[PDB]
Amino acid sequence: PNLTGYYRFVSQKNMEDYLQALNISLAVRKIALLLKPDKEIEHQGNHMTVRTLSTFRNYTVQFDVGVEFEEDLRSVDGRKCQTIVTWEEEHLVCVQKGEVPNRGWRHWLEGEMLYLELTARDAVCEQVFRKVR
Numbered sequence: 251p252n253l254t255g256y257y258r259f260v261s262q263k264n265m266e267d268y269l270q271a272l273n274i275s276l277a278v279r280k281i282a283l284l285l286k287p288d289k290e291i292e293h294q295g296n297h298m299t300v301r302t303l304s305t306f307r308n309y310t311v312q313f314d315v316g317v318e319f320e321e322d323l324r325s326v327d328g329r330k331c332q333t334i335v336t337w338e339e340e341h342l343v344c345v346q347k348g349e350v351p352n353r354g355w356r357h358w359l360e361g362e363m364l365y366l367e368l369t370a371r372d373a374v375c376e377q378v379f380r381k382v383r
């Protein structure tokens with residue numbers, strides 16, 4: 251599955267649980283829950299760039315599938331992670347090893363629908379995006 255596209259926010263669920271699990275303060279979560287970010291993906295070979303785009307903050311990550319890298323998440327929750335992305339069947343699976351247990355995420359594609367499950371500690375967030383065209 252090639253994931254290149256621009257994907258427009260559709261919905262989210264339990265994003266607050268996930269933000270709490272990353273130790274994000276109350277004031278910052280209040281605002282972050284109002285963002286409705288898009289995802290832009292460039293997927294060429296087994297290199298991917300993944301952009302989370304919002305009116306106030308972008309977060310970008312680049313990686314080769316299967317190669318561990320240091321992911322600078324300081325603009326998100328203040329941490330760095332040793333991060334690895336893999337293909338597990340048709341799911342793109344990310345484990346972000348560090349201080350926070352059970353931290354990572356899953357993408358999968360179903361037609362125009364890009365699903366995203368984000369996990370941290372006991373928390374699970376589900377986001378959905380719609381591809382354009």
Ligand SMILES: C=C(C)[C@@H]1CCC(C)=C[C@H]1c1c(O)cc(O)cc1CCCCC
Binds near residue numbers: 325
């Ligand atoms: C880049 C952003 C739009 C923000 C940046 C600030 C925080 C605390 C969370 C991110 C966030 C947010 O506030 C709401 C979301 O729906 C998704 C994400 C991106 C989460 C990063 C995943 C590794």
